[PDB]
């Protein structure tokens, strides 16, 4: 078969240096003139930056001169002025060139930090630049006389040496010099010689640089790049429409800055050719060559020399490098964003009538958005003759079009998105419901996922177009299909505020109320008792209920009974579906309980019942909260009667200690601590006064004189239910508020005695103001820090995707309850839930396997483990996965919005990064910066040091700035000796044995140490436990999984120790390496297999290494990446997410995982 020549669907991409002949291959003509357009007739001046002949026709299928105007003549080259008449679009495509007079350095390869021309020649940068500027002479191929090959000479020196040796010696200067150097260079010979020199001399200094350079050279040879190409003989010109002259209003013109630059280049070039033909003196033509160099540099990348300025405008002109780089840090237009058709946005409102699967979409918006569908559906049914008439109709908004819109809307989902998109739930698919209004209506239960208030936040709509997009939106991005946070299995659909105040008010009980003590047949006549005004919503009552238990085999058992409950609970029970026990609704129904109701319902009945359940819960919560008549008055906030007395006594203490400071019994600072302590104690007392009084003070009589229960006061119910408010804010309302602190952080010893229910005076308010402003500032800052962090995270993860099914390794980490210092800061059940078992586990007695090797532990399995006393389970993790270049689903876990095991092909790196990132706004060394420090693996300020090796140790030498520690292993050799500065107080016992990784001092320790001296499981455990300490201290739920995948990405690279295939000390992929030593253990060499050492790379560091260069050019410094890749002739195969996002094809994950896989196997095959 003939493979192909012309257009196919391409794979990979290649980048390298460009030959002059190559640059010519692209060029369809040489632009010889600085002229742009004719100045009256605006036609392009022929062979100029804007040209019809070289580039293309000005208007569609029309010759410039005007002779051939017909769409027939096409491949015709006009005789008058040759222009092939073709679409004007080809003026957006065709390149050009300029043949420079003198050679020119390409500023990218001269000024890139590791100067390419420089280190290829082993020639220092400043020397090379000194040569290019004609500031000195440099030797080339010196032969055998007096002189080194790379040696530089001055005027007089060159003269003398020339007088001595006429021939068999050579020296040039300028660009031609460097080009001659590069051309003369033989890489292979240098290779041989350097291998030898590497071998002969033993010094670290010598062979380090030696090996680095030889590797560099041989890489450059293998590239296919010849050094000469770093010096430009020919300069390509960019297509005109990519740097347009296009006219504006007022007859004014506007053009790209590349025109000024290209113009300058052409000018000085032609003038140089002229100066050559005029036989000018050296001092002139040299100046001209230099100026040409500067012009070219300014064109390519401006700012590495002089930063030339555009005509009449101070602001420096944008060069091609600046064209590529973009702005806003690193953003390549697939990054910062891209404008998109079929979209819209507006202010959002509530819409409680909605089912959770839908959203209100404004009429006009739907019309405009679905306009093309409407056009097609209108003439398909034949209501409109032609598409034109269809437009006329929808523009007239004729009566018949609304029905057609209702047709095209029905099964067609739409995507809704909010401004701060963090986790994947930031975008959710809904079924559109036509609404009269300009506002978008969004289901209340979703408001938590978007973090969307109703205070004027806006949402954007996007219309999924292709069939695949509709089905993706419906089966993936659909609201009902994500009920659970991907971070943790807990429901994100949890009722928010009004609803929970409703369910809370519903099931609650007062002491005495209408219908107290009576009995009812069932929930029906309970509700009937309530709605008729006979019985009160909350009263202690026995009613018969019928509950169910699915506890049979897949089967629902029925049981009936007389339960002691209230009227409200009885009414509410009507909603609860099937197999749930009445136990769940018989409580007070707080936010937590009202959430666990949903959770249990989902882990029992399945998805659909849970969906409709949540819906009904919302409806009833709203309705009954509305009926309840909850409100807030000024008298709802109750101040303690004892407040003033507490204030007075605590105010007596301060005058006590003040008297002592006057008499000098106590020091000023000690005094300060004392007074601050008494005032703090005061605040605690007032708070714990107002809390008792607010909470229990309802004193009410049933048939006797008195009884007291939890208060029915509004603000209390609100704070208690979890609807809104909290003990702190309520404390600020009634009790006194806090003690403030100056910006310094020195806490003021005269606290705010007054509260918000009372007035604050001038000073108090002024002092509160700082707290406010710093609050807004800090929060608004932590948003940015969160974003930056997530960014680093997806950058370090991204392409990690579930790929294989099961690697099948027994490997994994030991999962224990966290058990910190007190009782159980987090159980075992949460840590092991949804995680696969590495191996079978035991009862206290054995040959009884409860959980059999690798099995997803769901709620039932975890409860079965809980029945038994088992404290310990070994669990497979993403960090331990044997699979290379990805994670097997069997290792990951089940976690998702769905309880089933993770699908094959879902991209986990991204969702992990997101899951870690989203809560980051809620985090307060400790803190979010501590989190960053952890993920960056930064060695702390005052780190500890761990024993290098086990065995008895002792102290040696003296006081040089380090008092040396000598370790003595039992069997093995002693010589390990570390230099410990003695000015730091030690721990380690001079007479005792210390295990490797023991405490030889105090303070935090760098995870590099934990990785080396303790090992991979130990280091991953340290990272996960510390970061989880940070999050969990703030009340943030994040599964260990995501952190573990980030960790896996951190340790991706490692350094080799032994040899037999590749180089000694190289940092490299443990995927590559392990797949190589697994392959080397058999066949090949019988075993030559090398030993490596696992390395720890920070997230920002590990992100640096990416196979794909297109990917790297996105988030890294673009200018460097492009060069560094171009010299190696690096070939990007795509294969990742970011790269395929940039190039604009299907993501090698998700739905596209079926595509890229089917193509991946076709590649490197028959």
């Amino acid at each position: 078969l003939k493979a192909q020549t012309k257009t196919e669907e391409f794979d990979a991409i290649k980048i390298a240096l460009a030959s002059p002949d190559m640059i010519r291959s692209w060029s369809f003509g040489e632009v010889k003139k600085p002229e742009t357009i004719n100045y009256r007739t605006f036609k392009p001046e022929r062979d100029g930056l804007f040209c019809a002949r070289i580039f293309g026709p000005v208007k569609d299928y029309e010759c410039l001169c005007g002779k051939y105007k017909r769409l027939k003549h096409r491949g015709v080259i006009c005789e008058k002025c040759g222009v092939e008449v073709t679409q004007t679009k080809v003026r957006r495509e065709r390149m050009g060139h300029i043949e420079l007079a003198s050679p020119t350095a390409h500023i990218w390869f001269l000024k890139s930090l590791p100067s390419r021309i420089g280190l290829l020649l082993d020639m220092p940068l400043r020397d090379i630049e000194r040569v290019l500027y004609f500031e000195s002479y440099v030797v080339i191929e010196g032969g055998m006389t007096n002189l080194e090959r790379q040696q530089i000479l001055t005027e007089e020196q060159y003269l003398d040496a020339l007088e001595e040796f006429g021939d068999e010696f050579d020296a040039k200067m300028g660009a031609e010099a460097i080009q001659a150097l590069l051309k003369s260079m033989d890489l292979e010979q240098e290779c041989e010689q350097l291998r030898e020199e590497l071998n002969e001399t033993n010094s670290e200094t010598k062979r380090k640089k030696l090996t680095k350079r030889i590797k560099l050279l041989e890489a450059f040879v293998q590239s296919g790049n010849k050094p000469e190409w770093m010096i430009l003989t020919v300069l390509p010109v960019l297509p005109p429409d990519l740097r347009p002259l296009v006219p504006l209003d007022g007859g004014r013109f506007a053009t790209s800055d590349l025109n000024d630059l290209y113009r300058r280049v052409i000018n000085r070039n032609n003038r140089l050719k002229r100066l050559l033909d005029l036989a000018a003196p050296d001092i002139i033509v040299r100046n001209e060559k230099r100026m040409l160099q500067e012009a070219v540099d300014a064109l390519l990348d401006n700012g590495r020399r002089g930063r030339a300025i555009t005509g009449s405008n101070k602001r420096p002109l944008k060069s091609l490098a600046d064209m590529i780089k973009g702005k806003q840090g690193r953003f390549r237009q697939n990054l910062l964003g891209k404008r998109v058709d079929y979209s819209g946005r507006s202010v959002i409102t509530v819409g409680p009538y909605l089912r959770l699967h839908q959203c209100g979409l404004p009429k006009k918006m739907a019309l405009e958005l679905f306009k093309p569908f409407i056009y097609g559906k209108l003439e398909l049914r034949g209501l409109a003759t032609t598409i034109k008439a269809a437009k006329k109709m929808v523009e007239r908004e004729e009566a018949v079009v609304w029905d057609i819109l209702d047709e095209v809307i029905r099964e067609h989902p739409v995507l809704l998105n909010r401004a701060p998109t963090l986790h994947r739930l930031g975008i959710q698919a809904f079924e559109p419901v036509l609404i009269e209004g300009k506002a978008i209506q969004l289901h209340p239960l979703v408001c938590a996922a978007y973090n969307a208030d109703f205070d004027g936040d806006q949402m954007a709509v996007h219309v999924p177009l292709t069939l695949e997009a509709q089905l993706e939106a419906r089966a993936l991005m659909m609201s009902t299909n994500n009920i659970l946070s991907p971070a943790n299995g807990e429901p994100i659909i949890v009722p928010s505020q009004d609803v929970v105040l409703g369910l809370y008010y519903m099931t609650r009980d007062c002491v005495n109320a209408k219908g107290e003590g009576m009995v009812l047949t069932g929930p029906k006549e309970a509700e009937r008792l309530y709605r008729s005004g006979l019985a009160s919503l909350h009263a202690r009552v026995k009613v018969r209920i019928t509950e169910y238990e699915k506890d049979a085999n897949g089967e629902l058992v029925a049981k009936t009974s007389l339960k002691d409950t209230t009227v409200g609970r009885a009414i509410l029970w009507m909603i609860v579906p099937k197999g749930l026990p009445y136990s769940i609704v018989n409580q007070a129904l707080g936010k937590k309980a009202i959430s666990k109701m949903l959770n249990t319902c989902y882990r029992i009945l399945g998805l659909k019942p849970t969906v409709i359940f949540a819906d009904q819960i919302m409806y009833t919560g709203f309705a009954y909260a509305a009926r309840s008549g909850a409100s807030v008055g000024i008298d709802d906030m109750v101040i303690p009667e004892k407040k003033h007395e507490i204030i007075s006594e605590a105010e007596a203490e301060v005058a006590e200690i003040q008297e002592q400071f006057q008499s000098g019994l106590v020091t000023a600072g000690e005094r300060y601590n004392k007074v601050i302590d008494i005032w703090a104690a005061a605040n605690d007392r007032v708070s714990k006064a107002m809390m008792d009084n607010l909470q229990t003070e309802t004193v009410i009589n049933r048939d006797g004189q008195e009884e007291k229960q939890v208060s029915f006061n509004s603000i209390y119910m609100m704070a208690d239910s979890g609807a809104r408010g909290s003990a702190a804010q309520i404390r600020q309302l009634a009790g006194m508020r806090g003690l403030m602190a100056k910006p310094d952080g020195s806490i003021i010893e005269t606290p705010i005695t007054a509260n918000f229910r009372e007035g604050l005076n001038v000073l108090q308010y002024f002092i509160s103001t700082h707290g406010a402003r710093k609050g807004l500032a800090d929060t608004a800052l932590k948003t940015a820090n969160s974003g930056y962090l997530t960014r680093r995270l997806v950058d370090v993860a991204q392409d990690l995707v579930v790929t294989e099914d099961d690697c099948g390794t027994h490997e994994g980490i030991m999962m224990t309850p966290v058990i910190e210092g007190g009782d159980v800061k987090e159980p075992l059940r949460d840590r092991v839930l949804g995680r696969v078992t590495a191996e079978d586990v035991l009862k206290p007695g054995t040959a009884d396997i409860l959980v059999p090797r690798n099995t997803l532990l769901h709620e039932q399995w975890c409860d079965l483990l809980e029945e038994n006393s088992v404290d310990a389970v070994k669990v497979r993790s993403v960090v331990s996965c044997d699979t290379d270049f990805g994670v097997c689903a069997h290792c990951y876990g089940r976690d998702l919005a769905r309880g089933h095991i993770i699908n094959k092909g879902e991209a986990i790196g991204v969702i992990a990064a997101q899951s870690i990132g989203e809560p980051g706004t809620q985090l307060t060394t400790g803190g979010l910066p501590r989190v960053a420090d952890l993920f960056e693996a930064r060695r702390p300020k005052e780190p500890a040091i761990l024993a290098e090796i086990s065995g008895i140790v002792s102290f040696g030498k003296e006081t040089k700035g380090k008092r040396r520690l000598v370790i003595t292993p039992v069997d093995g050799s002693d010589p390990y000796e570390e230099m410990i500065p003695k000015w730091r107080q030690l721990n380690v016992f001079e007479g005792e044995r210390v295990e490797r990784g023991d405490v030889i001092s105090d303070g935090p320790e760098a995870p590099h140490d934990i990785l080396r001296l303790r090992g991979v499981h130990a280091v991953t455990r340290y990272i996960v436990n510390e970061v989880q300490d940070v999050y969990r201290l703030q009340g943030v739920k994040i599964n260990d999984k995501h952190i573990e995948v980030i960790v896996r990405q951190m340790l991706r690279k490692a350094t080799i120790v032994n040899a037999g295939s590749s180089d000694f000390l190289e940092g490299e992929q443990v995927e590559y390496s392990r797949v190589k030593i697994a392959n080397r253990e058999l066949e090949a060499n019988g075993k030559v297999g090398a030993t490596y050492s696992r390395d720890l790379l920070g997230i920002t560091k590990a992100s640096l290494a990416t196979e794909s260069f297109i990917s790297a050019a996105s988030f890294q410094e673009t200018t460097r990446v492009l060069t560094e890749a171009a010299v190696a002739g690096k070939r990007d195969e795509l294969r990742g997410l970011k790269e395929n996002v940039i190039v604009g094809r299907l993501i090698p994950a998700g739905t596209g995982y079926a595509y890229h896989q089917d193509r991946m196997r076709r590649r490197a095959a028959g």
């Binding site: 742009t36 506007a254 020399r305």
Partner: protein, 470 residues
Amino acid sequence: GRTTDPVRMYMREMGTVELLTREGEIDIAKRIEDGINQVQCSVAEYPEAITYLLEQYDRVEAEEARLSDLITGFVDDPELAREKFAELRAQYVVTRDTIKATAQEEILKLSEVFKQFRLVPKQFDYLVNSMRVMMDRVRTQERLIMKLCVEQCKMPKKNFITLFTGNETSDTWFNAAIAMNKPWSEKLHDVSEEVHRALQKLQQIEEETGLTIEQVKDINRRMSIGEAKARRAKKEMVEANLRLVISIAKKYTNRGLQFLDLIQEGNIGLMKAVDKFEYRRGYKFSTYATWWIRQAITRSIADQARTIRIPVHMIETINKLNRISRQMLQEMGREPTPEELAERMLMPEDKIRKVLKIAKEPISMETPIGDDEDSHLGDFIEDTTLELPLDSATTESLRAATHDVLAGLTAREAKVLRMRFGIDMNTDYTLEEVGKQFDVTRERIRQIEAKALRKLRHPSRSEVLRSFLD
């Protein structure tokens, strides 16, 4: 040492050169005269340089050229030219027949008359080029004959130059020197077919050019030396005078061209000034060079300093328009009306507006607009040349509609209507063409077409198409 910023590595590099004394200028200029006159005389000593000029004047009076393309004039009109050329031809026709010892005295005078002619620079260049190219022709045979002996047949060059000098044509060296019984002598036989045959163009040189291989070297060698002296001296002068160029170019700074560009153009101007200067007129070289440098600078600025190139007169016009503004601005109290300076200017006066427009430089497309954000002017320029999809769909539908409707008419009427217009076909066809195709011709078609239109005119047919016209 080097701050870069090439203005500096220039400023310092030229600043080494010392300023010329008033006498040094005349020394150098005298050197110039020496060199040039050497090449001129070397031109006068070439026979072909004469004969060519003669043939060219034979072509001039034959109307195959013009008197301006040969001479710039002599020292000193067509009659005078005719008689001067007559004089030249006379000295040539004497010197030619006198070749029979005494002839030299005339061959000298033959040069003199030939020197009376001031040649067009182009012609002179053609002559010089002819000479040096002829010397390429000599060097070809010299090196051929040398390599065929030394490199191929193994003969030492030391013995190779012995019978060479003074002859290098006749058979004295080739045929009489191979019998010498030297180690290299008998080896000369293998190549003898190649050396003797390429010796044809050699001796031929002494026929066309009219000089033995001896003289052909000496003359244009002397020429080469002269040119060398010339260029050497002139270069020296310019290198000495660069400071003037700089000092002048400092005036033209902000006109829209870079500093070094200015001083380079001015440098070129100084070079031209050296080339055209004559010290015999007593005019100081400084004030003479000034005009030239200023000329190159201004001319170049006018030409290349804009994105949109404008003619010189237009530029000057704009400038005058500026002057009028400057005077009348505070004079009129606000500014003169757009038509005010119009009458002040000589031309039609509405031109102001037109001119006033085209004068404006295009705004950088990268000009930032509000928020300081990535919003830049060029981001908001919308493509108006794109056709909207809303219309594209209708362009696609119109084809289906007119296709169905064209399925309506008789197969021949359909063909005639599809032919009279470009429907599904290349171009479109003249009605005569349609006639010659259909074999039923002329008025006939025009009738059928009409009735065809008539069939699609009244609605059953018309309801589908009428919906298209908006």
